[PDB]
Design a protein around this ligand. Structure first.
Ligand SMILES: Cc1ccc(-c2c([C@H](OC(C)(C)C)C(=O)O)c(C)nc3ccccc23)cc1
Ligand SMILES: Cc1ccc(-c2c([C@H](OC(C)(C)C)C(=O)O)c(C)nc3ccccc23)cc1
Ligand SMILES: [Mg+2]
Ligand SMILES: [Mg+2]
Lengths: 157, 139
């Protein structure tokens, strides 16, 4: 029911200190990318999608019906880059549940490191690093950053 | 080799473009930064370090690259910095060539920069496929 194909991503906006955090999760691996955007608008979300599309083979982006995600400028970026958009209810279990859990875990890590940085965006990037490098499943287990690169490499191969 | 990166700043329309190149694959990441300072370069490095296993960053002697803030980000993330000692200079020349082709298609320079990064990394294996394979086979 939850699409874990190598090209599937879940995106959503979370909030802290009156600021907007655009977060993306590569569903199958748990790898995340986050950015603090000045406004919760299509222009900022489309620029974020353009950057994400340049690194990974993004085939599908699952979002809620938020005005920034359903905007013309996001549709133009997804269409230009060759990405499919799927809209669902905010926090729905099939297409928004993986990003819901990642946002909750991301906020927990930001709260731990917040003291270490002056700006929120810095603490957000420190928390993204900590999340993507954390090792899951036993001592010799792999991290999200290692899982994404392996999932995509074995998908190509 | 799997963790070696090169960083440099190029300029267009009075704006600063911070460009990273994964030497072994030709994969690039670029960002338009408001100022050519340590703060902007350290934030960019913090983002890059979160996706790829960056072991070394090679740069020139530019004040933004030799700053205490960049050193603090590299020390925190566990990255080694090397200064002086032309992969990024060829990538900055190719990136400007692609931006010039697509510049008409976008209003903002940053958008054209990201469109050019997409075109470069997907060209085709492609630079985007080479990085992911180099790192997966390294692991
Ligand atoms: C992991 C980490 C990296 C850099 C800093 C740092 C920051 C941070 O901001 C950015 C540069 C923009 C990343 C911040 O928000 O604290 C600042 C404003 N000045 C500094 C001065 C000296 C040493 C370090 C810094 C803090 C933590
Ligand atoms: C690949 C691509 C995606 C979106 C645009 C786009 C932009 C651009 O900016 C971002 C939204 C921030 C990407 C830009 O700089 O031209 C703007 C300001 N208005 C639009 C209106 C209608 C359709 C598209 C756009 C341009 C290129
Ligand atoms: Mg939402
Ligand atoms: Mg220079």
């Amino acid at each position: 029911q939850v699409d874990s194909s190598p090209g599937i991503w879940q995106l959503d906006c979370t909030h802290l200190e009156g600021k907007v955090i655009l977060v993306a999760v590569h569903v199958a691996s748990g790898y995340i990318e986050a950015e603090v955007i000045p406004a919760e608008t299509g222009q900022e979300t489309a620029y974020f999608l353009l950057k994400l599309a340049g690194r990974w083979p993004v085939k599908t982006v699952h979002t809620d019906n938020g005005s920034n995600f359903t905007s013309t400028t996001v549709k133009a970026a997804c269409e230009w880059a060759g990405i499919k958009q799927e809209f669902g209810i905010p926090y729905n279990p099939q297409s928004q549940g993986v990003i819901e859990s990642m946002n909750k875990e991301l906020k927990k890590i930001i709260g731990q490191v917040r003291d270490q940085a002056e700006h929120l965006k810095t603490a957000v990037q420190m928390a993204v690093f900590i999340h993507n490098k954390k090792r899951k499943g036993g001592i010799g287990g792999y991290s999200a950053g290692e899982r994404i690169v392996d999932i995509i490499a074995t998908d190509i191969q």
